[PDB]
Design a protein around this nucleic acid. Structure first.
Ligand SMILES: Nc1ncnc2c1ncn2[C@H]1C[C@H](O)[C@@H](COP(=O)(O)NP(=O)(O)OP(=O)(O)O)O1
Ligand SMILES: [Mg+2]
Ligand SMILES: [Mg+2]
Length: 430
DNA sequence: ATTATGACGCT
DNA sequence: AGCGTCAT
């Protein structure tokens, strides 16, 4: 009753750039715009690996982690842009710089947490407060929300047959039910959050050309879930009240962090399918199956409640370079291993020097990760050393020193290496 | 031969 | 410190 928290204390958004690498290439090459298009890295093996897909191409069944030669089977007129290759490896600088463009625009509106190169959470609570003070009493026009969907609406009682008519009918029902006079209203606060996110997305598109989708809700998990409900180039508001119906048919694997082994164990141990079915277990039961942390998180989350804060962090925490050496390309000699460590270290030094100049910080730890042929784990081995100088030869030599005992016997390297990974971590101000 | 990255938890 | 998990 009057003491049960409802998780309605914040307004949180998740902004996702639509098929981001594709949009970057389409801005650069207008011939790719409004066409079935994909971004591919490498070329020789099966036409290269597709890593990003325009929505026009997705309509043909093209997906990420598909060989370009196969995608061309589904979509013969598919257009391709290739990731830049530098020092024998993919070089993602263009997309990192485009991401900075977008994140810097977002940070004018509110505090952002950079979740991925194409994804940021937005803590809007303060901004909504301020905007509500700017409009105390003024109702919110549907015109301020021209790309917003209200999840769960319309509901109940002929233009209902087109998606935009559905969208506007749901929005109308929502706005007609609002109570503009109450400044503490969670639904009103979400609505103003959505107004601000429309403004943010307009500014991103005006100033970069890039479109995005967004979710607006009371916490990061719901905002992330909401963002995916209406894509591309749209945004979705998930209210607290929408959660019981939304979760009642929502596969557990769709909630962030439950798409892997933990979600699978939840399904198998509890014998359920949908997020809402979790409400019928006590907090102690969930803790007994999944641990104290996971159980408390599940108990609250299936009720729409989550407390993970939007961390104020615009910049990545790590700067890493890695390359897989699959199949017959696996590294089998000492010279090979050392040459590729050098290539990785040279890209790393370039990026680290640029980072130190841009962001007034220096990395202090170098993490060296490798995978050995036959091992299915992402990393077979991780070892750290001190990162004391932004010097590619020193960094590559140090990484070799740290990994070289993994070699059984040689000039020869066995077992062959299928992955090398250098990561600069543990930044401090400079 | 479903990349090249990121973020983060457990012990 | 080193390994495991989750994500596109
Ligand atoms: N596994 C991977 N390999 C390469 N690039 C990747 C990647 N995962 C993400 N990216 C980068 C490169 C891609 O630009 C993007 C793909 O990740 P989403 O954000 O999950 N999906 P998208 O942006 O394509 O569209 P939308 O979310 O609107 O549906 O992020
Ligand atoms: Mg995206
Ligand atoms: Mg994304």
């Amino acid at each position: 009753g009057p003491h049960m928290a409802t998780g309605q204390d914040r307004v949180v958004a998740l902004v996702d750039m639509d098929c981001f690498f594709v949009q970057v290439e389409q801005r650069q090459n207008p011939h790719l715009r409004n066409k079935p298009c994909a971004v591919v890295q490498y070329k020789s093996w099966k036409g290269g690996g597709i890593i990003a897909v325009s929505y026009e191409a997705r309509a043909f069944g093209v997906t990420r982690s598909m060989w370009a030669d196969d995608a061309k089977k589904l979509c013969p007129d598919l257009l391709l842009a290739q990731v830049r290759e530098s020092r024998g490896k993919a070089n993602l600088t263009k997309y990192r710089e485009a991401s900075v463009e977008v994140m810097e625009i977002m940070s004018r509106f509110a505090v952002i947490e950079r979740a991925a190169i194409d994804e940021a959470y937005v803590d809007l609570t303060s901004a909504v407060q301020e905007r509500l003070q700017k409009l105390q009493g003024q109702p919110i026009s549907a015109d301020l929300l021209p790309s917003t969907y209200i999840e769960g609406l319309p509901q109940g009682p002929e233009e209902t047959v087109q998606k935009e008519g559905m969208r506007k009918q749901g929005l109308f029902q929502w706005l007609d039910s609002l109570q503009i006079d109450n400044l503490t209203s969670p639904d009103l606060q979400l609505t103003v959050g959505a107004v601000i996110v429309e403004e943010m997305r307009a500014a991103i598109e005006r100033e970069t050309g890039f479109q995005c989708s967004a979710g607006i809700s009371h916490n990061k998990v719901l905002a992330k879930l909401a963002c995916g409900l209406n894509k591309p180039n749209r945004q979705t508001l998930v209210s607290h009240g929408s959660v019981p119906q939304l979760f009642s048919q929502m596969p557990i694997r769709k909630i962030r962090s439950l798409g892997g082994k933990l979600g699978a164990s939840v399904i198998e141990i509890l014998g359920i399918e949908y997020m809402g079915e979790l409400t019928q277990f006590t907090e102690s039961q969930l803790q007994s199956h999944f641990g104290e942390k996971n159980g408390s998180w599940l108990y609250a989350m299936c009720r729409g409640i989550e407390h993970d804060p939007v961390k104020p962090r615009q910049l990545p925490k790590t700067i890493g370079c890695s390359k897989n050496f699959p199949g017959k390309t696996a590294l089998a000699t000492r010279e090979q291993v050392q040459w590729w460590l050098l290539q990785l270290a040279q890209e790393l030094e370039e990026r680290l020097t640029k980072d130190r100049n841009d962001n007034d910080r220096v990395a202090t730890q170098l993490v060296v990760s490798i995978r050995v042929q036959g091992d299915k784990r992402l990393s077979s081995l991780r070892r750290c050393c001190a990162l004391t100088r932004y010097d590619a030869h020193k960094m590559s030599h140090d990484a070799f020193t740290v990994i070289k005992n993994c070699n059984t016997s040689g000039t020869e390297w066995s077992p062959p290496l299928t992955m090398l990974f250098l990561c600069a971590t543990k930044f401090s101000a400079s």
